[PDB]
Structure formats: C-alpha cells, structure tokens
Amino acid sequence: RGRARLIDTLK
Amino acid sequence: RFLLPPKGGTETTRRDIYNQILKDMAAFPENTIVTAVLASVDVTDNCAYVAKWDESSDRIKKVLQRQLPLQELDQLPDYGDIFAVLDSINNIITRITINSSSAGGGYDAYLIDFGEHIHFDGNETIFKLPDDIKRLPAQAIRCDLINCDIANMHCFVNTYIKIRVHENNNSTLVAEPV
Known about the structure:
- The structure holds two protein chains of two kinds.
- Chain A has one helix and no strands.
- Chain A has one helix at about 5-10.
- Chain B is mostly beta strands.
- Chain B has one domain: SH3 type barrels (Roll), CATH 2.30.30.
- Chain B has helices at about 15-20, 60-65, 130-135, and strands at about 30-40, 45-50, 70-75, 80-85, 90-100, 105-110, 115-120, 125-130, 140-145, 160-170, 175.
- In chain B, a hairpin with a 4-residue loop joins strand 1 (about 30-40) and strand 2 (about 45-50).
- At the A-B interface, helix 1 of A face loops of B.
C-alpha cells in the first residue's frame, strides 16, 4: 500500500 | 503537458529546505513520550521522521483523502513555496515544495508531511492550496533514533508509534521508539 496505508492510519 | 517553471524563489539543498519550512518543534517536548506516525525511514541518511498529525492538521488529512476540491495549477509556485501534488499511484494529494532544479533535468522536491525527498519531472498534476492549509507546519520532523535498528523500522512507516524524546534542538529530534 505504501503511503496509502497512512489513510487507514488517519481515518 | 509540462508546467511552467517557478518564476521566483531561492533554490536550496535537501538539508536547507528542511530548515526553511515551518516546523512546530514544541509538539515534541524533551524527556517526554509522545505518540506520532512514523512518517518515513531513511537508512542511507541514518534518520527517520515522525509526524504528530494533530487535530490541527485535519485539513491536510482532508486534502490527503481527496475530500477537498483544489484549483489545478499550470504554473509552478516559487521555490520554497508549499502547494499540493497528486500521487495517483497511491491516489492521494500531498503537500509538496520545489527546492531546486535537478542536474539531470526536472526538479528536486520535498514532501513536507512525509519527510521524503523526491524527483519532480514537471508534468505532474499539481494544485493550489487554500491559505490556511498552506500555512500549516510541516508534519514530518527529522529524528536520530537510538536503541533502534533503523533498517527494521520500515515495517512501522505510516503507523502510529510511541517515541521518547531524548533531545529537541528545535531542528531535529533525538528520540527512541518505545
């Protein structure tokens, strides 16, 4: 996922 | 298909662009354990980056999740100015600044909320940020990590961790993941 994982971290 | 180059601004190095963007170092008090995202890991420089991602950074999160409309730009802002770029590989929109021209063509760019220095070809999709999101401090703070194998830390990127702030020289941190 890379940086996309950050979305799941900030949702 | 290619953007118009920056009309002004002082070109800076990778190191100087970190020092010239706005960082809130008061969010990492010394001899205190704080919770922050492991923004990125740079084993070659033997450093990492941590980001508070506070409630005050909420608008940056909105831009990141593509939940906010932005005005597309055909002209690159000045060197050192903060705008937004679309990373469609990850389908996010992230804050970015152009710090210098590149010797092999293109530009040296810095993603201020990740702590990542990237190459910017000049044909990317870029947006103007609203003034309140543009003025928000860069989330990524550089850290020397102790009691830590930095190479092992790639598994915690983009993940909330807890760090103990040993030192805060108001530019970079000396911290330890706990």
